[PDB]
Design a protein around this ligand. Sequence first.
Ligand SMILES: [Ca+2]
Ligand SMILES: [Ca+2]
Length: 191
Amino acid sequence: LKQQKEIIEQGIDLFNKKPKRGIQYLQEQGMLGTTPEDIAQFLHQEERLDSTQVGEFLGDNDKFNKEVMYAYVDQHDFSGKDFVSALRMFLEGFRLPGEAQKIDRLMEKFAARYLECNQGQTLFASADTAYVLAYSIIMLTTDLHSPQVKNKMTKEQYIKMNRGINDSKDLPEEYLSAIYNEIAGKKISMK
Ligand SMILES: [Ca+2]
Ligand SMILES: [Ca+2]
């Protein structure tokens, strides 16, 4: 159709079939800019973009996708010295892709952005500490809250995931138990 209102909704529909097709259509139509920050903002603002497609797009290895993903994470504010809440805010927006390589890029950038927003912060010696913790949380919430895993990961098990070879860049066990309790009682969701 003709009205820009309709064009945006058509782009959104097209994105839901194939993200890059939706983006290009909107760019052709003069409805969307061409920088990573333009696309990232679009991704943040349009709640009707399909959750799974946003995850696959943000996690994709192509150069342009990664730049969009960086800008997308940079438009979050992760202040407050509250790691899990930060991660929950991040993962409210879309559905994590399945491919481990994708989760890995997403978790690495999440961790870098978290520390950048918490510079006086104390627990995490390096981005790697944060990245490993974040990844362990994804694994924990998948293990605890997927009925296909019948032997659930235990608190002792979880703590092991977060050791070696850093061994001082390593997190207190009391902190890992508290996170375990938090994730066991309240799954990571989009809702
Ligand atoms: Ca988000
Ligand atoms: Ca999610």
